[PDB]
Amino acid sequence: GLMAQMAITAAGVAVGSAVGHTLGHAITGGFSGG
Amino acid sequence: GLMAQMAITAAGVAVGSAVGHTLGHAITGGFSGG
Amino acid sequence: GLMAQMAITAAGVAVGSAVGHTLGHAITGGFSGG
Amino acid sequence: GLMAQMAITAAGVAVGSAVGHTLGHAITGGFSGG
Amino acid sequence: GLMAQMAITAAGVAVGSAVGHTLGHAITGGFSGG
Amino acid sequence: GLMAQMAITAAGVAVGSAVGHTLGHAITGGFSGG
Amino acid sequence: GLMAQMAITAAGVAVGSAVGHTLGHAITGGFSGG
Amino acid sequence: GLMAQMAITAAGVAVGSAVGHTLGHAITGGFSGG
Amino acid sequence: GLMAQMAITAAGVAVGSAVGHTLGHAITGGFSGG
Amino acid sequence: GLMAQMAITAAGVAVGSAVGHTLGHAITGGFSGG
Amino acid sequence: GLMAQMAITAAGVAVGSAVGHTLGHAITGGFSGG
Amino acid sequence: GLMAQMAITAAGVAVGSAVGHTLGHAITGGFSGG
Amino acid sequence: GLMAQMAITAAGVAVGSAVGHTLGHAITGGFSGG
Amino acid sequence: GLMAQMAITAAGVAVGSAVGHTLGHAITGGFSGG
Amino acid sequence: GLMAQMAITAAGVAVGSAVGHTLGHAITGGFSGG
Amino acid sequence: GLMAQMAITAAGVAVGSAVGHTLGHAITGGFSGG
Amino acid sequence: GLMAQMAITAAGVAVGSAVGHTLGHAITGGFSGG
Amino acid sequence: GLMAQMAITAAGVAVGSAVGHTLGHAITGGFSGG
């Protein structure tokens, strides 16, 4: 029984082009993870 | 019995082009994950 | 018995072009996940 | 017996073009997921 | 016996073009999922 | 015996063009899913 | 039973080109991880 | 039962080109990890 | 049961070219790791 | 002005079960394609 | 003006089960493609 | 103007199970491709 | 103007299970590719 | 103008299980590639 | 204008399990590549 | 204009398990590469 | 214009386990490379 | 214009475990490289 607060599971990834945010956390301001 | 607060499961991914946010968390402001 | 608060399961993904938000969380303001 | 608060299951995905929000959560304001 | 609060099951997806919201949650205001 | 609060099951999907909301939840205001 | 506050699991990654943020944490402002 | 505050697990990585932030922490401002 | 405050685990890495920040911590301002 | 000697264009495909020949060429004997 | 001697274009494919030949060339005997 | 003697273009592929020949060339005997 | 004697282009591939020949050339006997 | 005698282009590959031949050349007998 | 007698181009590969031949040349008998 | 008699180009490779032949040449008998 | 009689180009390789032949030449019998 | 009779180019290699032949030449019998 595993837990993931933020999970992005992509086994096969092939990106020809990606301008800007890509598969990440663009967090701004606040985030209460405690 | 696993739990995922934010899950994006994409086994086969092939992106020709993606300008801007792509498969991520563009979180702004607040998020209570505790 | 697994649980997913936010689940986007896409086995085969092929995106020719995607300008803007794509398969993500554009969360703004608040979100009570506790 | 699995549970999914937000589920978008799309086995075969092929997007020629998608400008704007696409297969995601454009959540603004509030969301009580606790 | 599985449960899905929000389910969009589309096995074969082929989108030539989709401007705007597409196969997602454009949630604004509030949502009591607890 | 499965249950789906919001179910949109479309096996074969082929969208030539779709401007605006498409196969999603344009929820505004409130929704009591608890 | 493992836990991941921020998890991005991508087994096979092949990026032809990616200008800007890519598979990371662009955190600005604050983040309460304690 | 392992825990990862920030985890980016990518077994096979092959980047043809990546200008800018790539698979890292572009943290600015503050971050409470204690 | 191991813990990693900042973990970037990439078994196989092959970077053809990467101009700028790459697989690191571009921390500016503050970070409370105590 | 494109030409296709054998064309089977099916944008959205969802096959629950298919025992035997399925969406292919079961060519036996001869075929003069020159 | 492209040409395809044998073309099977299926953008979105989702096969639950397929016993036997599936989306291929079961060529036996001869085929003059010169 | 491209040409493909044998083309099977399937952007999004998701195969739950496939016993036997699947998306290939089961060529036996002869084939004149010169 | 590219040419492919045997082309199987599948951008997004996700195979749950495949016993036997899968996305290949099971060539037996002869094949004149000169 | 490139040429490929045997081409199997699969950008995003994710194989859960594959017993037997998989994405290869099971050539037996003869093959005239000169 | 490049040429490939045997080409298997798979950008993103993620194999959970593969018993037997996998992405190779199981050539037996003869092959005239001169 | 490069040439490859046997080419298997896989940028991102992640193999959980592979018993037997894997991404190689199991050549037996003869092969005329001169 | 380079030539490769036997080429296996895999930029990012991550093998969890591989019992038996793996990314090599299991040549037995004969091979005419002159 | 370089030539490689046997080339296995793997930039990033990370092998957790590999019992048996691994990234080599298990040549038995004969090989005419002159």
Residue numbers in the entry:
A (entry chain H), B (entry chain G), C (entry chain F), D (entry chain L), E (entry chain K), F (entry chain J), ...: 54 to 87
Per the authors:
Structures of D10 and D2 fibrils assembled in vitro from the low complexity N-terminal domains of each protein show that their core comprises the most highly conserved region between the two proteins. For D10 and D2, the central conserved VAV motif forms a beta-strand that is associated with the protofilament interface in all the structures we have observed, suggesting that it may be a critical element in fibril formation and may be expected to appear in ex vivo structures as well.
D2 also features disease-linked mutations in the region constituting the core of D2-NT fibrils. Notably, the most commonly reported pathogenic D2 mutation p.T61I33 occurs at a position facing the interior of the D2 PF fold, suggesting that this mutation, too, could promote alternative fibril structures. To assess this, we solved the structure of T61I D2-NT fibrils to 3.09 Å resolution. These fibrils featured a novel PF fold, consisting of residues G54–G87, that differs from the WT D2-NT fold, all three WT D10-NT folds, and the S59L D10-NT fold. In addition, the T61I PF fold appears to contain several LARKS (low complexity aromatic-linked kinked segments), likely stemming from three glycine-aromatic dipeptides (G59–H60, G63–H64, and G69–F70). In contrast, the aggregation rates of the T61I D2 mutant did not result in substantial alteration of the aggregation kinetics of D2-NT or appreciable signal loss in NMR spectra. However, the T61I mutation in D2, which also incorporates a large hydrophobic residue, did not result in substantial changes to the aggregation kinetics of the protein or in appreciable signal loss in NMR spectra, indicating that other factors beyond hydrophobicity influence aggregation kinetics.
